[PDB]
Ligand binder design. Structure first.
Ligand code: 43Q
Ligand code: 43Q
Ligand code: SF4
Ligand code: SF4
Lengths: 402, 402
């Protein structure tokens, strides 16, 4: 499909923009002052597949901790770029702690959390000046939870002058886009390079996000950071995130993504990285790991045996991945089918790299295996699972041989 | 947004089509012969919100059980329409067991599982004849796991004659659409009403599904049953389902949906109904239950307290829903915010019906609550959670009073 062309912005060693794979990022939830906790969580997130990690730089204690966090990450060869999240006092922290400024790989600015009235433009310029001095890229990140009140008022008035005014909600979305686009144009006029600017403008409802990002994509040339903000907890958060991003990503809009889930108490922060990966992979945009295609099962197959086989295949693939990723470049693209009966079993299996079709009700007790679209063997008896996994291993060795 | 206009097809008492809410359906996985197990699961699915329930009618024993299943459902006032899923021997079962034919509310036919060569058209006509006799609606449901081989061959040849032939994969998608569209046109020519025909053409990859359904929507006037077939297990299944459907639903394509997840061993079959609901609600197309908007939390808030509050609010809303749904019509639209700090807390809360913003790091220990966009109160001390839930209850009573 189409991918929107953009200049390349390097965030540390990671390039983002239309010429590069869409990058997965995340954000810590440890207090940034706590150097031990924050370093450990940055590493955890990076190991799960966060190519870029953001951390809040909220107060002086946080700022003073950043250089030590960066130092520890580098000591273990962990080249993970760090993004500093600034609100209200970004200009003061970057001025007062130049070592923190230099240790970050990117600054995030929010045009609605710069200061009130006259403070705004001066605080903005000071942060942009510092980024230009140190050669750092910046994300200008608008969020409708912190929308600039004076800009909203300006656009509400323009709207009230229209022959047919739009709803309050539509004007809020207009204002959000305008906040980002105006600050983008200001930073460029100040001399920040096109290769140093990423944009976002996040809302918490899927259909609104699609409208906003279509506007941003039309009105600017910058790489876009895409996310549904405040997506929430559990299945609701996951579904909403996937639903909001998909229409945009299929249209070629978006260069980096973050999934904004509320973790359940005791649930790992890495869940959001796993979801981000699954969105990109489901849309054919990146490949992170082999995936199992399996039917829901119905009354045509025995539910327990089928469900346990599919689960067993999935678990084994996950167990082998670290090894396979090292020996068999390209293996991330592998598609394995596990199907419940003859209705769609063979056909789906033939569309996979390798697939097995169980015998359902009414059929003789044997399971055909297909690979590269043709019959490979027919399994029977116990250890169907072990025999199929051995076939998958052998197929991987042969196809993804260096 | 846009909704594609279509005639209305009644599936039992449930209308589907462009004038009606998008209907959620599911499918049993019990052996249909087992009357007790199947009835119980139909009820379970319906209670979770499956407006229509499909069951496989695969052999003579299944067919003989359907009338008794329908009888038991009606005895408890459970008006849930049943869809019969037929493959290979549909024509024989419908002819041989007219009581089963009459007990179903809809027949599903697959144009790739009718029989080979010459059998196809005669088996198709016999099933359509029976549906016309009994006034039953039919879904003509194509699936790329069971694609008609002779049609594929026909389209592969047409493709090989093109000045620039398309890939094998693109021709498969062409053939899938063609299978559904041709059978649609055949059924109409036989005299089945436009008010009796629903179409589907499912594939297991998201970007392919979007292409297919855009073609179906253009080429036919029928209500469309939308689903990503064989979506698989766990988070992968959920994400893929949401990602595939969203672009279509936002464009106004789709009149009923089914989510095709593989259950984990021991996991309830109702999970797919919950996911379907969440997709529709995330896109603003239906409202099933109040939803909590919450931030991911970062280093600006204390992670445990915030995460436990958000979880507590969610659990309480879920506890009250059966009652609230009965007393407060419209309450399904309720949006509650639970936010971690002052950065986006107030703003997001003001966009909700009612929201609370916790104090983060550096702030005085108090939590503003907003309702209908303005400050309602400020909470402090212990029992913030209980006090906020009491405010949510009071807000619901006042706004959603009959
Ligand atoms: C981190 C904080 C600052 O706006 C937000 O509340 C949550 O993060 P998010 O959903 O990734 O949204 P942002 O890109 O930070 O605007
Ligand atoms: C039930 C069976 C018949 O094609 C499939 O394997 C799975 O169900 P599904 O994903 O809902 O797809 P269908 O609408 O049944 O084609
Ligand atoms: S492949 Fe067979 S068992 Fe699986 S859902 Fe389809 S028809 Fe049912
Ligand atoms: S609202 Fe505050 S605590 Fe929550 S994610 Fe945003 S900045 Fe962090």
């Amino acid at each position: 499909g189409m991918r929107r062309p953009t200049p390349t912005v390097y965030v540390g060693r990671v390039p983002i923009g239309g010429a590069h794979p869409i990058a997965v990022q995340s954000m810590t939830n440890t207090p940034t002052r706590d150097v031990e906790a924050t370093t450990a969580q940055v590493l955890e997130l990076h190991r799960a597949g966060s190519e870029i990690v953001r951390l809040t730089v909220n107060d002086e204690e946080a700022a003073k901790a950043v250089p030590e966090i960066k130092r520890r990450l580098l000591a273990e060869g962990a080249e993970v770029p760090l993004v500093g999240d600034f609100h209200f006092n970004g200009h003061l922290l970057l001025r007062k702690y130049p070592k923190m400024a230099e240790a970050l790989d990117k600054f995030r600015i929010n045009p609605g959390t710069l200061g009130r009235g006259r403070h705004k433009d001066e605080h903005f310029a000071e942060m942009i000046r510092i980024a230009m001095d140190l050669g750092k890229p910046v994300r200008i990140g608008a969020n409708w939870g912190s929308l600039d009140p004076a800009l909203l008022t300006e656009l509400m008035d323009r709207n009230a002058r229209r022959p047919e005014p739009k709803s309050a909600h539509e004007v809020v979305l207009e204002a959000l886009v305008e906040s980002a686009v105006r600050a983008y144009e200001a930073a460029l006029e100040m001399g920040l390079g096109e290769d140093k600017l990423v944009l976002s403008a996040k809302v918490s409802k899927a259909r609104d996000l699609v409208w906003v990002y279509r506007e941003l994509a039309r009105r600017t040339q910058a790489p876009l950071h895409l996310g549904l903000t405040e997506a929430g907890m559990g299945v609701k958060g996951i579904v909403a995130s996937a639903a909001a991003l998909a229409p945009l990503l299929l249209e070629g809009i978006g260069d980096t993504i973050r999934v904004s889930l509320t973790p359940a108490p005791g649930e790992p922060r890495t869940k959001e990285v796993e979801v981000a990966q699954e969105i990109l992979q489901a849309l054919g945009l990146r490949a992170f790991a082999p995936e199992v295609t399996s039917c829901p099962g119905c009354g045509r197959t025995t539910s327990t045996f089928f469900q346990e086989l599919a689960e067993e295949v999935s678990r084994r693939l996950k167990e082998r991945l670290p090894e396979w990723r090292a020996r068999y470049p390209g293996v991330e693209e592998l598609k394995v089918a596990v199907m419940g009966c003859v209705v769609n079993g063979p056909g789906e299996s033939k569309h996979a790299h390798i697939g097995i079709s169980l015998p359902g009700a009414g059929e003789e007790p044997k399971a055909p295996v297909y690979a590269d679209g043709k019959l490979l063997t027919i399994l029977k008896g116990e250890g169907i699972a072990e025999e199929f996994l051995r076939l998958v291993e052998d197929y991987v060795k042969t196809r993804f041989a260096p």
